[PDB]
């Protein structure tokens, strides 16, 4: 039952900390136009 912490990455990853301290989207997006189209 020791599996409350089960970050499935190789420690080098800064996303394995999901749903705890990850919500930090930067307005540096090169995908600004992508979100305007999406369906294609």
């Amino acid at each position: 039952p020791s599996v409350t912490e089960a970050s499935p990455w190789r420690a080098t990853n800064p996303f394995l900390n999901e749903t705890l301290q990850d919500v930090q989207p930067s307005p540096i997006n090169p995908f600004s136009a992508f979100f305007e189209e999406q369906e294609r």
Binding site: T12, N13, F15, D22, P25, I28, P30, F31
Partner: protein
Amino acid sequence: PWAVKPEDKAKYDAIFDSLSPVNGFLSGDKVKPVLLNSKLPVDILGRVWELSDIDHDGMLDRDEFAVAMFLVYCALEKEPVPMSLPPALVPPSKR
């Protein structure tokens, strides 16, 4: 034929530099939100990270990141992403 064509590399160097990098390397605290530049979720963004950081030094080198961001557009460009390392995009610098 390294996937990050010098045109995209230089473009990635532009976003790279814009983050005020560390010796030509960027790390997850900066890179992740440039990953979150997309509508992509941290599962793919993280998988991309783990693949894109070839040397696994914990930092994304100019080449390693060029790899990452190339894979980021790949997902947005409606192209399925691999979980294995495609040597066409394994940075010749890091080989």
